[PDB]
Symmetry: D3
Subunit: 175 residues, 6 copies
Amino acid sequence: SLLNVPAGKDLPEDIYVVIEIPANADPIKYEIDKESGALFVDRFMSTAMFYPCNYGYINHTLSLDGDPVDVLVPTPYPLQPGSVIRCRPVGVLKMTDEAGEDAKLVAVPHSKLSKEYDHIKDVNDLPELLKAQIAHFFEHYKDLEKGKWVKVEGWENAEAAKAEIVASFERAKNK
Amino acid sequence: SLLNVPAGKDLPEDIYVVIEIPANADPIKYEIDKESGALFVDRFMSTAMFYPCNYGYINHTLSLDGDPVDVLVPTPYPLQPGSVIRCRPVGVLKMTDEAGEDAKLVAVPHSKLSKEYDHIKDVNDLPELLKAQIAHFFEHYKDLEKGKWVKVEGWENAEAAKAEIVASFERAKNK
Amino acid sequence: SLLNVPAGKDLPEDIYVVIEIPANADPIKYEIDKESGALFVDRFMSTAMFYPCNYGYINHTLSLDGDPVDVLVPTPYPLQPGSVIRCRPVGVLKMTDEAGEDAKLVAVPHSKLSKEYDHIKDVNDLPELLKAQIAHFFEHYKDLEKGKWVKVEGWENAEAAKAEIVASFERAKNK
Amino acid sequence: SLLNVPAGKDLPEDIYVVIEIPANADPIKYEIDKESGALFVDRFMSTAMFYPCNYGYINHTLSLDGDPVDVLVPTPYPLQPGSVIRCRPVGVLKMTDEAGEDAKLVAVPHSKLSKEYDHIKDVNDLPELLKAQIAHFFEHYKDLEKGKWVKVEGWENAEAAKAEIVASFERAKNK
Amino acid sequence: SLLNVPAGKDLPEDIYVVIEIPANADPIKYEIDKESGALFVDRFMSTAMFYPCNYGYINHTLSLDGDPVDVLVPTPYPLQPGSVIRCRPVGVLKMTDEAGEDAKLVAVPHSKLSKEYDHIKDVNDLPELLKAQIAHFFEHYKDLEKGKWVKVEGWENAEAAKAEIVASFERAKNK
Amino acid sequence: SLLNVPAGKDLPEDIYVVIEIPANADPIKYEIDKESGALFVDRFMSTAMFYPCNYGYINHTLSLDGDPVDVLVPTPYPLQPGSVIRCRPVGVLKMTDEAGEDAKLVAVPHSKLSKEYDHIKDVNDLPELLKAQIAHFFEHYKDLEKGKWVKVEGWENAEAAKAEIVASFERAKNK
């Protein structure tokens, strides 16, 4: 099942990301149910926006918020919901919302899948337009949702991203 | 697996529907194989028609025909085959075919997923065009199939729909 | 060509809208070139947003900003860029951008094309979510654009919409 | 513009069909406006059905019902509305609607465009399923439309198809 | 899971093929991970080509190369990745690449799913264009991949295809 | 109509490209008919390949082969056939087909349309993979076509591209 997928071949440099929402899709927020491994409709987004990159999570990880570490993965073509892609972490988007602080990793496809992202080693290697769109999206997609808000803090490097993966992987074993 | 999905959070008012065919899709009739939980191609439809709503079933239910209770779920955008959506039953389409009588439930997305269908509490709240299209579709999609026929009897309210879910849920435990 | 299409069969109640951008499309801002009547790429939008309705204009009209009256037209399925649709105005969204006061009308398909909008006669008849999405889209679509900003002032009625059509049509005759 | 396209390179054997509706498309009935040459939305179909083939007409023809000769053109991939395709007529579907006798030709892409239809020379050469789908589509697409009905009378040959082209072309010159 | 799917109802005449890549899809090479049964991104194809037919494998089979028997299945509409289709083998494409010899089966949908391929009993019944495209695709899709090459040897009949299935099915039990 | 579009706002640095075939589209080779300005189906491609970039031409130019200068335009999203895009030439692909020497320019969207191509000033600036895909596409797209073949000679710079634009534009005035 999707539940038996490893966190990666070699954490934190080489990871697997389970895709829940493809880039440029209809406004349907899917999520893999942790009990069944099936694709559940979380909700229909109320704003006329779409995810700038494919969005998913690393299996076997646990953030302080209680959910697995989520990741944004740009690809040349949108991926299938429920598919798994081998990636390499390059940065992290730090934010704060109504529930506390949050963080989203950005990972690019591994060199075995494509050599198109080999020159991207860190958060500042990503195209500035993409970073602005990802930032803009998170600050506004929940605008029509009563009682919800998001404020982007800033970006952190690949090292901060790797740190988060290792920390959240360990935490998944313990608590 | 898709096989471990509950029938709902609170039957019969709050249910989960496993989607087999999205609304407005190519004429491919998919079905989740009950042995494996995988998406099987049942057949290629012979008529130039498409399902007016997403079509699926409630897991852990058993109709008199021997198959789980099937449901039609309208959404603002077509869903992914194999996805599960939280719904609320609003009516039932009664029919008769070459194998006996049949019935299809109509359920709308739960308020947690969207508030767009909150004003729809019963079968007569559904738009008249949609009801006419659903009716028309079932009476004609199998027209080029030798020895098959369908005759629509009429619609029944939310209470009749809930009754069918409770009855079929119980029946799944017993026989 | 598109330059020869009438403003409507019976202004301001029965109008024709030339569609430039379809609902739920990729972020490509097309525009009909007034000299050639051809579909030109105006720009690639920078935000991850899409038009909640088909977007276009009424031919032979000239609003104060120098361009034809623009309109948003909800349809059950996205239309083709460059197609023309017979509508009935039902409201107007008033805003204030960098230039000054701006207005975007909302028209629904004429009854001869479809019956599902017959009940919508005025702005108050349009679903609240759609109105909120339209407003939110215009407030934020240009966020990542230098020296561009929009502020929404509110919704006005069918009479206010028709007034805009009439004034811009008359203004187009000689001004 | 589309109004200036020839009826064919060598009538009635080699013709040009102006496509108005693509195969397997959303239920939007487009029509080329004869005054402007622009693509107009005729109506939103009420039944959950789609055209089994691309649908259009031969320019410079006038059948008895007042409109150009209409044709269905199967292609391996759906075409663009407003595009023009060189075909070879192979048959005609005869029907009787409310107005009276009606006919819809079937033409296949010319050999210079593709080789996969070379073997189809007459109505008997078209696959049986496709013919059954076309017939079924015309009998039922207007079912949910007031005072509209169609009855299929049968398939006629290539010579009967060409005769219709010729009579309508000649009739168009002066009538 | 996809892992529990049978090789077929009646090998080698009646088989199930698990689909990994749909016909005419974006250049994403997916593969079902044999450990989890999940859809993994194998790689992004570097050439501007697409699979001419849906591509998958027969579960519970083992080729000399160590992987399950792969099959190409033409359908009238592209299938969903991860879906299973009931087929009937009709031929085999023999090839040689940088790793040794290879072979791809061609199977058509079973008559229960569609009667459209009933007249195709063997490799020479397939349309010549399709055979040329399949051949052409395998000889060129890996052209931009350093150190990889493919040379098509030729086609073999249904009997040679059935032989390969039986042999590979047996081999899956033993080694 | 499309026949009245200028070659560019400031040749050869600022040009307009009329798009005939979108990137990543079905294998239908469209062509704008020079007599009517309508989109004609030239042919259905025989190979399972797609154009890696949008493909079109510069109006009012005549290259040596008798046709307008053709160009490939990469965009983040595929464009509509028949649309016009303002570009900036950056290179040319030189080849030798059956007729003789051939050249296909590569132009990127103008900065007023998008900022993501600002850094690309010459052929050396285009990503290597895209250049390899374009070359490979032209070498093989006609493989399954009788008496048709292409051989790639190499990439030339922006100045060489502009020279071709200028010579073909001048040649178009009177030749």
